[PDB]
Design a protein around this ligand. Structure first.
Ligand SMILES: C[C@H](CCC(=O)NCC(=O)O)[C@H]1CC[C@H]2[C@@H]3[C@H](O)C[C@@H]4C[C@H](O)CC[C@]4(C)[C@H]3C[C@H](O)[C@]12C
Ligand SMILES: C[C@H](CCC(=O)NCC(=O)O)[C@H]1CC[C@H]2[C@@H]3[C@H](O)C[C@@H]4C[C@H](O)CC[C@]4(C)[C@H]3CC[C@]12C
Length: 127
């Protein structure tokens, strides 16, 4: 149950990480300067995050954890894989991608891998 409103303030390897994944400039220009917000909603197996960035564009995804072909990017591009829970933390696995998504303490903490190279992110809640 990841639900809430969270503000980000940490980006590590950000400009290279988001390019490799397939952001041209759109989300990364907004993240480096303004640092992204979100509103999350989890209904057991069913999941939704909605994110918002500087000019007040929305990007959402809605998927069922352990189900496939409903999951989409910061840009909102759809993909097919199996999102998995392990210790209550959400992960996908790909040839080119991996990541893991969790709550530590009261703070929200994410650690990600593309092409074998690492990203990590940090956020504070105010729901
Ligand atoms: C507000 C931002 C948005 C990320 C973004 O779009 N950044 C562009 C960039 O990284 O440059 C992040 C910070 C940490 C994220 C959370 C962490 O992964 C932990 C936690 C993981 C859950 O599985 C789903 C909700 C969420 C709260 C995540 C939702 C949302 O994703 C958050 C709270
Ligand atoms: C940073 C990556 C990818 C960004 C990207 O590929 N952008 C391409 C584009 O913008 O064109 C983000 C975007 C959306 C994310 C997924 C969606 O938010 C849904 C899902 C949520 C769980 O916390 C973790 C797994 C999972 C499945 C997320 C894994 C990391 C993804 C795939």
């Amino acid at each position: 149950a990841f639900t809430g409103k969270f503000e980000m303030e940490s980006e590590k390897n950000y400009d290279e990480f988001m390019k490799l994944l397939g952001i041209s400039s759109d989300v990364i220009e907004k993240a480096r300067n303004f640092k992204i917000v979100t509103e999350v909603q989890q209904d057991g197996q069913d999941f939704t995050w909605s994110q918002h960035y500087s000019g007040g564009h929305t990007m959402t995804n809605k998927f069922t954890v352990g189900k496939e072909s409903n999951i989409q990017t910061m840009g909102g591009k759809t993909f097919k894989a199996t999102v998995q829970m392990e210790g209550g933390k959400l992960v996908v696995n790909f040839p080119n991608y991996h990541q893991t998504s969790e709550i530590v303490g009261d703070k929200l903490v994410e650690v990600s891998t593309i092409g074998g190279v690492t990203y990590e992110r940090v956020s504070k809640r105010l729901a």
